Structure formats: structure tokens, C-alpha cells
């Protein structure tokens, strides 16, 4: 009924202390069957796709959220992150969100 959309706001930033837990949000909009969403981290000119991580779906009213879990948050997590969606055979990216540790 509608297009898949990733609503991370431009210039998003979260300043957190190491040793504490954190949940990084990726607002996903969908009208069909839930789309495949993934997370990456900016390292120079490429966004390094993150493997084997704790992630969760949190369904709301008009929106839904894909979350990356930092259980806990380490100092070697300071950087800018992004979520991407591959559905109709192409990759759609969101705005990058920065994490200050």
C-alpha cells in the first residue's frame, strides 16, 4: 500500500558513558510484509556492515522500529552508524546517527 522508508533524522547524536546499556533506533515505515533492515558503521568511504548482533523489532502505531542493542556500550563503539534496507533488489540507506562514548 506504500513504500518502505527509513526515518533516522539528520545530525542525530547520543552522548553516552561506557559500561551502560544502549538501544540505537532506526524508524522503519512499511505497509507490506516487514522489510529486511540491517545496520552498518561508517569507516572512511564505506559503511562496514555489522555481523552477529542483538537486534529487535518494536511495532508502534503508524511507525515501527529496528533497534541495535549495545549490552553494554564499549569505548571502541564511538562513531557514526546507519541502517540500510534491501527489498526490491536495491539498497536504501538512512541518515547517519553519531554515537559519542
Amino acid at each position, epitope marked *: 500500500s506504500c513504500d518502505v*522508508q527509513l526515518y533516522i533524522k539528520r545530525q542525530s547524536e547520543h552522548s553516552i558513558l561506557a559500561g551502560d546499556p544502549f538501544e540505537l533506533e532506526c*524508524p522503519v515505515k512499511y505497509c507490506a510484509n516487514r522489510p529486511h533492515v540491517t545496520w552498518c558503521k561508517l569507516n572512511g568511504t564505506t559503511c562496514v556492515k555489522l555481523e552477529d548482533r542483538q537486534t529487535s523489532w518494536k511495532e508502534e502505531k503508524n511507525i515501527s522500529f529496528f533497534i541495535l542493542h549495545f549490552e553494554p556500550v564499549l569505548p571502541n563503539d564511538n562513531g557514526s552508524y546507519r541502517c540500510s534496507a534491501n527489498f526490491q533488489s*536495491n*539498497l536504501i540507506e538512512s541518515h547517519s546517527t553519531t554515537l559519542y562514548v
Partner: antibody, heavy 123, light 111 residues
Framework: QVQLVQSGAEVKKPGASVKVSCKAS????????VSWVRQAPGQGLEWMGA???????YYASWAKSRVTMTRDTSTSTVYMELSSLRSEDTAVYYC?????????????????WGQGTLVTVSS | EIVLTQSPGTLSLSPGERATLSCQAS??????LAWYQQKPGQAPRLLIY???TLASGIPDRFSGSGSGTDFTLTISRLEPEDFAVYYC????????????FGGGTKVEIKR
């Protein structure tokens, strides 16, 4: 004002490389992306790729193997290097500023364009 | 992959008249569709961004419409400075593509 100024014309041998520069004035490179678009004589527009606001590079599927895109945020200059040049690469190369007009959706249009750089490739 | 297809290839219209430019995407691109004008020996110029919005200092005779795959650029009162070549561009995705642009449409004077 808000402008994009490119380097002078280039004449190259086949198998050589070319590095095109593109200077931003009136704005910040760390807020905008820069796309590269080439045009052959009498032909249509051909996207080569871009370096976004957050420093990530995208390349056209045909250009990934010979094209490199950089930025020097202090000098506020973007570059494009096209290596192992072929005669069929002769074109006018443009840098265009990518405006991510939407604050929630990662989408763009190219509002300010460079004056073009003619690169001739021949033996 | 995302393929932008422009129609017609060329349109012979007299000044004063109305132009209807068509751009079709192979798969949906939401409203990440822009329209440019290129006159001979000049760099392209942004007309309409976000499928329907007007760019900085662009006259009101240029109107954009559409969402997903079907898109139109309409010039209602074709002036002589309007006789140029027009290209559509998707800002939707950039990963593993041949070109973010359509093949263009030349608008020429019918006489």
C-alpha cells in the same frame, strides 16, 4: 556567492590517469555531498558517483574499478580520479552539489553545478 | 536495478504552448525525483526537486507531479528560453547502478 569551481581542461593518453578538482565557495562540504556527472559530445548525462555529506562514496557500476572520489574538508575541495583512461572516456566532467533537502529521508538533488571540465583521451 | 526511462525522445512544440515531459522508473523511487534543464554549451540546471517542489529562482510555469514510478514535468507557457533538453534524476538510491539519470527529452520549436 554559493559556487562550484572546477580545474582546467585535460588532454590524456590511453592508459593514463586524470584528477579533476572541484572547489566549493559560499558553503560547507561537511553539510553537502558532491556528485560527478560526465557528458560525451552530443550524448546524454552519465553519473559516475558521489562522496556524500558523511564522507561515504558511491560509484556507478561501470566506474567502480577505475574511479576514486575524495574530499579535503579543510581546503573545501573534492576530487575525482579516473584511471586507465580510454578514448571513449572523452567528455565534459561536472561536479554537482548534492542537497539532502529532507531531514528524515536520505534523498538528494543537485542544486549547484560546476562549469565543467573537458577531458580529452586520445593517442 | 533502478532504470529511469524518458518519453518522448523529442517533442516538436510551438512557443506559447504546453509541454508534457514523461519520466518512468523501473521500480518505485517514492518522490526522490528531480528535473533539470540543459541548454547547448551550458551545465544542467535544477528545475524541480522532490517530484513537485520548485528550486531557487525558478519561474512558476515549471510544475512537477508524480510519486513512485510515474513522473511529469509540465511547462504551461513555452517561452523561447525553454527550448532545451530535459533530464530526470532519482535521489532514491546509489548502490550498484549504471546511472541515476534518464536518457533526456529535447524540446524543439515546431515551425
Amino acid at each position: 556567492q554559493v559556487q562550484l569551481v572546477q580545474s582546467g581542461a585535460e588532454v590524456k593518453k590511453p592508459g593514463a590517469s586524470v584528477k579533476v578538482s572541484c572547489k566549493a565557495s559560499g558553503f560547507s562540504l561537511s553539510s553537502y555531498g558532491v556528485s560527478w556527472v560526465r557528458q560525451a559530445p552530443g550524448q546524454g548525462l552519465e553519473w559516475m558517483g558521489a562522496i556524500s555529506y558523511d564522507g561515504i562514496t558511491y560509484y556507478a557500476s561501470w566506474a567502480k574499478s577505475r574511479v576514486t572520489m575524495t574530499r579535503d574538508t579543510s581546503t573545501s575541495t573534492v576530487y575525482m580520479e579516473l584511471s586507465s583512461l580510454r578514448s571513449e572516456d572523452t567528455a565534459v566532467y561536472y561536479c554537482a552539489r548534492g542537497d539532502y533537502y529532507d531531514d528524515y529521508v536520505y534523498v538528494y538533488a543537485l542544486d549547484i553545478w560546476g562549469q565543467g571540465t573537458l577531458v580529452t583521451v586520445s593517442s | 536495478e533502478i532504470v529511469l526511462t524518458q518519453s518522448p525522445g523529442t517533442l516538436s512544440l510551438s512557443p506559447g504552448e504546453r509541454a508534457t515531459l514523461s519520466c518512468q522508473a523501473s521500480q518505485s523511487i517514492s518522490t526522490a525525483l528531480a528535473w533539470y534543464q540543459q541548454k547547448p554549451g551550458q551545465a544542467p540546471r535544477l528545475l524541480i526537486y522532490a517530484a513537485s517542489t520548485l528550486a531557487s529562482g525558478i519561474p512558476d510555469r515549471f510544475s512537477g507531479s508524480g510519486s513512485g514510478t510515474d513522473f511529469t514535468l509540465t511547462i504551461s507557457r513555452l517561452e523561447p528560453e525553454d527550448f532545451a533538453v530535459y533530464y530526470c534524476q532519482q535521489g532514491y538510491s546509489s548502490s550498484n547502478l549504471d546511472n541515476v539519470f534518464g536518457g533526456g527529452t529535447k524540446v524543439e520549436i515546431k515551425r
